[PDB]
Design a protein around this ligand. Structure first.
Ligand SMILES: *SCCNC(=O)CC(c1ccccc1)c1ccccc1
Ligand SMILES: [Zn+2]
Length: 257
């Protein structure tokens, strides 16, 4: 029932999901002049060399690339995190225009899109249990800007034709998410939530400072997806992003000076 339109978008979510007006909601604006370098933060470890993707799905909200998380194949460790967090999936949020689309902002700047690499804490055994824990998830957020094409994204872009509408999925094996990372692993980190209902406050956010560049043609293909299901009237999948929420009683820490 919730969505991203005028009668059911983010300003309405609180009626079915009162936690939307919560104490640690995401996304937020990242005030780079207020975030503090934290020297306690240990180095970030992104270990994706044995990653195993399975499938890509249009769920009506975005598209997810799903991974085999039955073992420690692609994991996130270090930084602010205690323990190992398993890659379960990734997705994007993007806009109708290159001037908007990200969820997090940097000094109020909106990027063209935002990549979320979603990982869960292995100490809680599965994702569904992890989301009911304040330290259950770790999401790696990577901003997208429009410029030169991102070669590691092209495999993703090409399959989208086969998952145009809500409920469609396709085989997506042997995709390597290392091709979606920037050079630098400099990040900001804060405690927050999922950015769609149920909006659970179970996330440790890790947002890379360095955006990746994608081409105009690549993001235009994202914009051709549909929110609707097959044989329903076309509603382009665009602007599936939730805006910045109140930081309230939280501190954003930086991994770099
Ligand atoms: S079209 C709805 C899209 N959202 C889902 O993928 C739901 C999913 C979730 C959350 C809480 C419990 C079970 C499943 C999810 C949402 C955001 C990030 C990761 C997973
Ligand atoms: Zn997301």
């Amino acid at each position: 029932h919730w969505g991203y339109g005028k009668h059911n978008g983010p300003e309405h979510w609180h009626k079915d999901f009162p936690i939307a007006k919560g104490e640690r909601q995401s996304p937020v604006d990242i005030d780079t002049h207020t975030a503090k370098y934290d020297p306690s933060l240990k180095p970030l470890s992104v270990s994706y060399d044995q990653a195993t993707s399975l499938r890509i799905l249009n769920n009506g909200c975005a598209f997810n690339v799903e991974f085999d998380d039955s073992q420690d194949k692609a994991v996130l460790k270090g930084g602010p995190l205690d323990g190992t967090y398993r890659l379960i999936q990734f997705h994007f949020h993007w806009g109708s225009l290159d001037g908007q689309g990200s969820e997090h902002t940097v000094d109020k700047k909106k990027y063209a899109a935002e990549l979320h690499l979603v990982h869960w804490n292995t100490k809680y055994g599965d994702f569904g249990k992890a989301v009911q824990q304040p330290d259950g998830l770790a999401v790696l957020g990577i901003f997208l800007k429009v410029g030169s094409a991102k070669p590691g994204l092209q495999k993703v872009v090409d399959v989208l034709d086969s998952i145009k509408t809500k409920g469609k999925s396709a085989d997506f094996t042997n995709f390597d998410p290392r091709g979606l990372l920037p050079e630098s692993l400099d990040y900001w980190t804060y405690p927050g939530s999922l950015t769609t209902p149920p909006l659970l406050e179970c996330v440790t956010w890790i947002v890379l400072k360095e955006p990746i560049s994608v081409s105009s043609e690549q993001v235009l293909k994202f914009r051709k997806l549909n929110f609707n299901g097959e044989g329903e009237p076309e509603e382009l999948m665009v602007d599936n992003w939730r805006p910045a929420q109140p930081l309230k009683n939280r501190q954003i820490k930086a991994s770099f000076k």
